Structures are given as structure tokens and as C-alpha cells.
A paper describes a structure:
Since NQO1 and GSTP1 are phase-II detoxification enzymes that reduce quinones directly to hydroquinones, eliminating the formation of ROS produced by redox cycling, the combination of inhibition of NQO1 and GSTP1 may offer a potential solution for cancer therapy. Though previous studies demonstrate the importance of NQO1 signaling for the progressive phenotype in colorectal cancer and GSTP1 is overexpressed in many cancers and linked to drug resistance, the molecular mechanisms of how these reductive enzymes involved in GBM proliferation remain unclear. Both NQO1 and GSTP1 are well-known phase II metabolism enzymes catalyzing diverse reactions that collectively result in broad protection against electrophiles and oxidants. Using a strategy based on high-throughput chemical screening (HTS) and affinity chromatography, we identified a small molecule NQO1 and GSTP1 dual inhibitor, MNPC, that suppressed the proliferation and stimulated apoptosis in a highly passaged cell line and primary GBM cells bearing the EGFRvIII mutation.
Glutathione S-transferases (GSTs) catalyze reactions between glutathione and lipophilic compounds with electrophilic centers, leading to the neutralization of toxic compounds, xenobiotics and products of oxidative stress. Attempts at co-crystallization between MNPC with GSTP1 revealed some electron density in the putative inhibitor binding site. However, it could not be fitted for the whole MNPC molecule. Therefore, we performed the molecular docking and subsequent mutagenesis analysis to elucidate the binding mode of MNPC with GSTP1. From the generated docking model, we found that MNPC was located in the active pocket of GSTP1, closely adjacent to the substrate GSH. It formed two hydrogen bindings with Arg100 and Tyr108 and one hydrogen bonding with GSH. MNPC also exhibited the π-π stacking with Phe8 and Tyr108. Importantly, the inhibition of MNPC decreased the most with Y108A mutant, which was consistent with the docking results that Tyr108 formed both hydrogen bonding and hydrophobic interaction with MNPC. Taken together, the data show that Tyr108 is the most important amino acid for binding of GSTP1 with MNPC, while Phe8 and Arg100 also participate in the interaction between MNPC and GSTP1.
Numbering used by the authors: 1 to 209
The structure:
């Protein structure tokens, strides 16, 4: 296979790029790094920023989850139709990343004490994406333009993990709710999301969700 994903046995920051690969009919190798392998230290020391995911496209070695997403978007035609749409795709992805960072901070550093405030603040964090959908073909296609982009897969993952954290959090957002249902039903993505490869991994690395 042309691609290799090097990561812990977690959905985490690889869920969106895996959904992209599966939905686009791509083949890839999963190199699963156990915690004991990670703690041995040698792989970590060889990683550019000391972290995973690590990704290979042939001999091209990449780090940074959003770099991997942008690489796949650029090379597979999932980055809008022109330069203006490319910028809007980036604007969406950067917004997704900001909220993912807040989610990660809650999960790994403050779940017990922070969850109630986080969930009560979540409608204002999700509203921008409903607004974006409302401005693009009435929310009936994708987050930018009329074709899927890497930002759709990242936004879809962000929405799915927040549905687990806070069931019903999309109920006030009809376009986001329909968008999740529509994209999740795409045949290859639907089959992947139902597969043990996905279902039998935890969302995060610390048992919380
Ligand atoms: N900004 C980086 C974040 C990388 C990151 O957080 N890696 C975590 C797994 S999600 C990790 O490797 N933790 C082990 C460590 O830092 O020693 C990205 O988007 O890829």
C-alpha cells in the first residue's frame, strides 16, 4: 500500500485521516505502536516533534495530523475547486483543530471537574459550523463548495466525538445533524465506521470519552 499510518491503538488524531482514506478507497498499512514500544524510547526519539502520528507516502515521511490531512487533500483532490475554496477549507479545518484542542485538554487534563462547563459552553463552539453550512447550498452538500474536502472528514470526526461526550449536542443544529447522518451513510465510510478496525479502538488513550 502507498500509505502507512504509525500510531497508538487509538482513534484520536488519526480518526479523520483514516475516514478519508477509507471513503476514498485508498489502501494503507497500520503500524500499531504499543505503549511498551513507545516507552522504550527509540521510536519517539526519531520522531521530528517526539510525537505520533507518523505517516509515510512512499519514501515521504510526515508528522503532524493536519499536515497528513492537507497532504491527502492536496494530492487526492479534496481541497476545494480553486484558491478561494482552498482558503475556506483551511478556515474550517483550523476551527476544527481549535475545538479538538479544547476537547483534548478536557479529556486528558480536567475531565472530572471540567466536563460540565465544557458541555455548557459547547453550543457556542458548534454554532460556527452550523453557520458555515447555512451559507453553502443550504447545508445540503459539504462544509465548503460542492465536493468533499479533508475538512469534512475532520469536522465529521469532531462532531462524532462530541456526540459521545455530550449526547444530543447537535439537536439544536439541524444542518449539522443532517450533515453527520449524510456523510456517515456514504457507503465506504459507513462500512469503515462499522468495521472492527474502527469500532474496537477507544476514542482516546486514557479510557475517557
Ligand atoms: N499537533 C500534533 C499533536 C501530536 C500529539 O499530540 N501526539 C500524541 C498522540 S495524539 C503523542 O504522541 N503523545 C506521546 C508523547 O507526546 O510522548 C498533531 O496534530 O499531530
Amino acid at each position: 500500500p502507498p500509505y502507512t499510518v504509525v500510531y497508538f491503538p487509538v482513534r484520536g488524531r488519526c480518526a479523520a485521516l483514516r475516514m478519508l482514506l477509507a471513503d476514498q478507497g485508498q489502501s494503507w498499512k497500520e503500524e500499531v505502536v504499543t505503549v511498551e514500544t513507545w516507552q522504550e524510547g527509540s521510536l519517539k526519539a526519531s520522531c521530528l516533534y517526539g510525537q505520533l502520528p507518523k505517516f509515510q507516502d512512499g519514501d515521504l515521511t510526515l508528522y503532524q495530523s493536519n499536515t497528513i490531512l492537507r497532504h491527502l487533500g492536496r494530492t487526492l483532490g479534496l481541497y476545494g475547486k480553486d484558491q478561494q475554496e482552498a482558503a475556506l477549507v483551511d478556515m474550517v479545518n483550523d476551527g476544527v483543530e481549535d475545538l479538538r484542542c479544547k476537547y483534548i485538554s478536557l479529556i486528558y487534563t480536567n475531565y472530572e471537574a471540567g466536563k460540565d462547563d465544557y458541555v455548557k459552553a459547547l453550543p457556542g463552539q458548534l454554532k460556527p459550523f452550523e453557520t458555515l453550512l447555512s451559507q453553502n447550498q443550504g447545508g445540503k452538500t459539504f462544509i465548503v463548495g460542492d465536493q468533499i474536502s479533508f475538512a469534512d472528514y475532520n469536522l465529521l470526526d469532531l462532531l462524532l466525538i462530541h456526540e459521545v461526550l455530550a449526547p444530543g449536542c447537535l439537536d439544536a443544529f439541524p444542518l449539522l445533524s443532517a450533515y453527520v447522518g449524510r456523510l456517515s451513510a456514504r457507503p465506504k465510510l459507513k462500512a469503515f465506521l462499522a468495521s472492527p478496525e474502527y469500532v474496537n479502538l477507544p476514542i482516546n488513550g486514557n479510557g475517557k470519552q
